[PDB]
Amino acid sequence: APSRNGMILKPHFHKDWQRRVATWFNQPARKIRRRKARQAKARRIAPRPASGPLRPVVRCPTVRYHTKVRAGRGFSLEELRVAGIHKKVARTIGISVDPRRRNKCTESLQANVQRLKEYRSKLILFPRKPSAPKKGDSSAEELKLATQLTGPVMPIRN
Amino acid sequence: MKFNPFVTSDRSKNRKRHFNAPSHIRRKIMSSPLSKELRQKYNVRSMPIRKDDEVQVVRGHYKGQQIGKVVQVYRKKYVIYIERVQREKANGTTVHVGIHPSKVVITRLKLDKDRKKILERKAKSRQVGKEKGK
Amino acid sequence: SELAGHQTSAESWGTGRAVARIPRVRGGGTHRSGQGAFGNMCRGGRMFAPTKTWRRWHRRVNTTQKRYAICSALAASALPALVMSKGHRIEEVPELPLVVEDKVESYKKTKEAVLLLKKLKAWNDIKKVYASQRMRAGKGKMRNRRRIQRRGPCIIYNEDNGIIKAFRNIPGITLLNVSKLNILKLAPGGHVGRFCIWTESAFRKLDELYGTWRKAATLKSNYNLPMHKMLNTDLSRILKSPEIQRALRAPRKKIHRRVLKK
RNA sequence: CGCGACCUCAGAUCAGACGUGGCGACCCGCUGAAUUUAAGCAUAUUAGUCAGCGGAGGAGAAGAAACUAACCAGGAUUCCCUCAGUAACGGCGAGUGAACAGGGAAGAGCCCAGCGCCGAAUCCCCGCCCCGCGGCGGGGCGCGGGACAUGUGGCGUACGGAAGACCCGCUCCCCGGCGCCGCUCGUGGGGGGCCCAAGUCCUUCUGAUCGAGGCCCAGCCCGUGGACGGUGUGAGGCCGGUAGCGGCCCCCGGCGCGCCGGGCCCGGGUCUUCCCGGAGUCGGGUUGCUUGGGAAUGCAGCCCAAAGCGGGUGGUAAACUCCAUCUAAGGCUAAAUACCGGCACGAGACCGAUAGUCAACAAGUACCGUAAGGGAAAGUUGAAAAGAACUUUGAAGAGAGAGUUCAAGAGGGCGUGAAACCGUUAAGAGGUAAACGGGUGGGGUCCGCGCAGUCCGCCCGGAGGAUUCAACCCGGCGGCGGGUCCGGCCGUGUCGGCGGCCCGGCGGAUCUUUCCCGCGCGGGGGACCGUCCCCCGACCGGCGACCGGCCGCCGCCGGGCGCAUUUCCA
RNA sequence: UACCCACCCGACCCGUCUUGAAACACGGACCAAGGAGUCUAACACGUGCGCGAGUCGGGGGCUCGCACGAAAGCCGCCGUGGCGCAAUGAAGGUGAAGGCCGGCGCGCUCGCCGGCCGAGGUGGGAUCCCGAGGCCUCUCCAGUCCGCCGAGGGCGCACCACCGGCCCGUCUCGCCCGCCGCGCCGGGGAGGUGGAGCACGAGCGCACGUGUUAGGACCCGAAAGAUGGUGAACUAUGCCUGGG
RNA sequence: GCGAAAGACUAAUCGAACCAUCUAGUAGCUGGUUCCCUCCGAAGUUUCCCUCAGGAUAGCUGGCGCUCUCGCACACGCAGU
RNA sequence: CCCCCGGAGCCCCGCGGACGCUACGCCGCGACGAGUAGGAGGGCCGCUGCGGUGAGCCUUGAAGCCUAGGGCGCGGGCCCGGGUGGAGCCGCCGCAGGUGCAGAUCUUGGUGGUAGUAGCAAAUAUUCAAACGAGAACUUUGAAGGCCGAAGUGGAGAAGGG
């Protein structure tokens, strides 16, 4: 029974809500279950970017988010045979590989190739064995670091 | 303040851990201090009371200075009986009166193979921590 | 429970058997037969509107609101009138914004922490706290809230270098890190002005923690102290300055008892 | 009229395995209402919900695009915030009602068939030995079987692949054991066992205290321990415990080196020759349920029923027409995600015996119903039974004495012991039922008194008796206020120093890439402005923000003052 | 004042629905304990507080085994996003400025070029400012200080009434256009009218109150409907087998 | 279901069993709705409604305010006249 | 000259201000006070719990209960006196509610008046003596009178009971 100038108020409680109410008293304890995992995973893969593998630079689709730039799903294939990184190997050196990205432009290609050239340079490959062959960076730049990169590796700043 | 979670500190929960406590546990709970003389010689503060230890009553109506020997241990009634600790019933038939070990002092332990390794490992533990803090 | 007094299967045979029209328990050869269930009135039954779990338990405050609740909390930790008026037994303390050396961060035996609170003449607060021990009044006894006492002096420290181990046994003492201040412990009970004992390292950071007046916080993102609705908070001096006194109508204090009409 | 292959198909208490049932909070298939709402009601709504039924797991399902989009484009699934109560649906009413993008949690990708290549390169079960045996396996040896040519294994699967040619660069992992070395985060991984500070000190209460004063700093001691429980009250110290990178002993977990047994000749980039995709499916017609999906979102049944520059999608049917974007008809997959069942725990601004679960107890018990089902009531002696010996009356139940107790005015359904109601004692009343409101009077129980209640407090006057000062100076201490702002410290407004400016930083789409580092961009320096800090000088608010001297006054202490003073008392 | 008693006056038994209850209207023997406007969400206005053209708050994140912690603190996350900062049209879409002056197109109430001012005006308007004149002051006059009264005169907030103006939709009518294109192209004008509009802002968040709803919804109350189940030991028949 | 038929009977139940659930079904209709004091204080009329035991809107009511006025020798405004 | 209150001596004192000034305190004037439904305000009105605080109270006696005991408040209620009772409890400043009962043919439990009343009336029937026993109309034995009258109140079974 309306009275004197309210709104129309279609509220959705006709169905049965009391049964399927989800209260959030887990909320602060879930903050902690995740925090241990986040930590226990970083201590498990000790020298490694804690954030995870490297993701590519990428533009947001619709015209309202035109001008932003994101961290994409994985570096594309067309990108990779420009920097000269085999597609199956990159999965093993912390490079997200997305075999599903149609490259339409050279602008976003080179901009995104640069991160892969940049990754190589500041990448330290612990060699396969202690006494191991080429492409494993020397022992000088092996003692220098055990540093997990807290936070995203090379964060994409708009 | 207690810190360790996985301990209770709950008014009714460890009242329940008491009067449902099995006989194996109830030994440690029915422990009574040792007299100043022994407490010097062994470096042991307290002991589970035994069947034939000697004892002085310290509190209660007939606290005194006479040294009786324990007779039995009502671990179910959770209280001990002593030597001349006794009252006269209506028919003259005397009964013992229970005494809680916490309200009694041991004056001469009844030694054993079992009891000695207890007194050693109690003392060795007491001076291990004093060496750890040192 | 969602099932309080709601697992009975009572029908309310009614209106012609002279009894009540209340849902009464079916059949049986017990007492609980023709009794009355699903009623707030009746034995068994349920309550009115069973307390449900999704009551809005938790509350909210604006960020700046609960920041500026700490400024007024701290500013009143000075001003011994406000402090003593909370019954914090500060009569021998050498100065009210009591600063201590940063040796205190490294004490590791309650003996030293007890010795410090004597030389600063802060014992008397724990002394008071020591005397306020007793049993709570109500049914709170049989729910793990048995004993109660006053609050003691709070101690603030910039780094836990062992100090919280020292001042841990002394009752009433709470430890508050500077970078993590807490209205619920600086101003217990929504009253203002509790005793605080700052260490030197923490006393420096305070202006860099949340700001002086003509400078940013530089540890919080964007925050500065609140301004004043008025500066000269005293008006006894305002009201007898020559500026005000000069421009005043002269008083009227010849209280005119009413005249009886003859 | 025989014997022999194979194809179909039987029988075995044949050799070896495996399935059923239970639980059911969460999960996955299907089935599927009506109360209700619309103020009637049939569409709608309740609601793809309850019940029904099937099936699982420690999570399930989903999942590697026949996607989203229209952008300078994104990139498996699941969850959270958001989109948004919005696009749409609807007797366009009641009501219903998504997604995309963006942020975040997490983040992992992969296999077949086919087309082909390879001497079936394969797999299973037997029998002997070698190791291993409480998740039955590896190693070898056998004309010991059998499956398989109606198709097993290796490469390979669309992100391309194979095969070739030549371009470049040089080769450890896997598993079965056998050991051994570091016990490997709650700050020694999981579990078990046993262990680790300090008063029963003085006095005093009391039935008994764990209480009240006291005790070398809130008293003694300990305090990395002051949580809790026990104990004849209210205990850090009496007892268990508590804290503690505290100790010790087993077991289990998991990771690290060695030995052995076996498996494995496994790359990377360039040019050419071919090689390709899942049919009674897609799609269309139609009918029914479903979504919000509309000239049909999804699902079905029936009918029709494909294609190979094809097919699907591109959210109003249709033709023509261009673009975009995927690759269906086959399969596997951890992580965030859910848990009113179960094991094991922890906590609470919760309830406190008609409350809290039906259940604090022999409770899903007693009991009812043929049965499906229904389903209670009921906690407390004391601290210790010390639970009333004995004498006596009585057939006995019950008493009277006695005794135990701090208490039986705590006696076995016994703490406290209310009201209704009843019993008797005391007092007062009583023909208009009682009760009641206003007003007094009479009587009572007590209560205040008085064995005068004459209530006190100043000041003063008088008469008695007693101690020391006030008044005054002198010594000391301590204040107050004052101004000379006098000397110094302090801060407000202003000015000067351009002095901190780089020995002050932070901020800024300010400016320079003359710079530096890294790859036009990023980082760093240098220029600029706004802001915050040093030197000194001046004016002024000289501000409770002080310090020192000088002064004036006060007070206290100590001296001096001995009595027309100054106090006390009556 | 409260216990008992006495008297004089007054005086019908409460709850309830009701035009009307002491009612020959209904509930009520008595006494104990229990017992009824709750929570959530969504609006709305009022009020308090923080910040203010912004302001958050959530989810995340960074910090603990919580004792107090499942707290507090912090984060270009702080704006991804919501709400606000802008409307109006069904939609393609457009989108809040005028005034003035001078100069130039014929000032043509039309089009263009340089300068000034910038949210227009009228009437009330709390009201501040300016104030003629007074009113004394122990003398006659002189005269600077201090206020009181103060006719009259000015700025004029907030708000109200009105007239103007601008944005968008629609209409009418009419003019000149610009030209990367050609005008079934786009662009401007005058007058009226539709609008939840602008016309130098007031929101956001957090509390609390009141009210209205959706919720079991202030408590108790149907006759029913639906889904699954259990019954022929009574009784209704049929059958089988016995007995009278 | 069963009925030589009365809507009979179906475990004290029959014009449609009993049990549990959906379920706290719905009620414009009865009944109840818990401490004091202080201030203000109604309606039973209007139009519309499958409206006539109910609502919607009018009034009448209260609360909250605000804008001013000037009894501060110096008032405009209103009105059951 | 016509002087200074650290003193004019004060009915005005402007040099310093109440006892009074919890500044949401205190005070002086007037006016006015019916009330259902309803609204609003105030409640040192009350109930339970939490954060504070009361150097609160407490085995020299807390809660509750009981009181022809002394009183305060318009009242909600409150304070004291005694008594019994045997372990905890309240005041103030804030926060939170499952917060106040006469009533609902209310729920559960308890208890009255009715009332020592209705009632212990279907099938004809008992009596004497003894025994036992604390105790006999009612048991047991004896004696007498009687009924059931073999389609039984007699002698055996089924189902059911256990």
Add this chain to the structure above:
RNA sequence: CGACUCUUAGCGGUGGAUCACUCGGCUCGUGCGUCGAUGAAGAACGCAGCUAGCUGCGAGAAUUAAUGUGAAUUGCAGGACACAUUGAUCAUCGACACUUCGAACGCACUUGCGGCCCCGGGUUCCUCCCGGGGCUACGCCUGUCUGAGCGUCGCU
């Protein structure tokens, strides 16, 4: 002062309120995430020196061995034990054991009937008979054996 009645109070009953307790709930977190044809969940019947119920157990039955633990158990008995001893008791539990139903399994539900193997008595397999042990359910897989078919053939 007769009795009755009423009011009030003192005490006494009746009744169980209030109050104070609480080995119980409720709620919210956390870790784990554990059934069964080698016979589950559930049900029946048994089992203590004196034992009905709850609980604990399964003819080895108020427990068995084992390992920690280290002197009780208790209502009363009664006891072994040597408390210098697996050592009383409790906890753990990893050795062993598991009556009858129950998916329940030879066929049936009366508790009745069988079959097939074995080993005791009987027999001297002589068949019963008596006693004891192992099998005998449905569905399905792989393999194995014995087969059937005017199914396709081949050889004859």
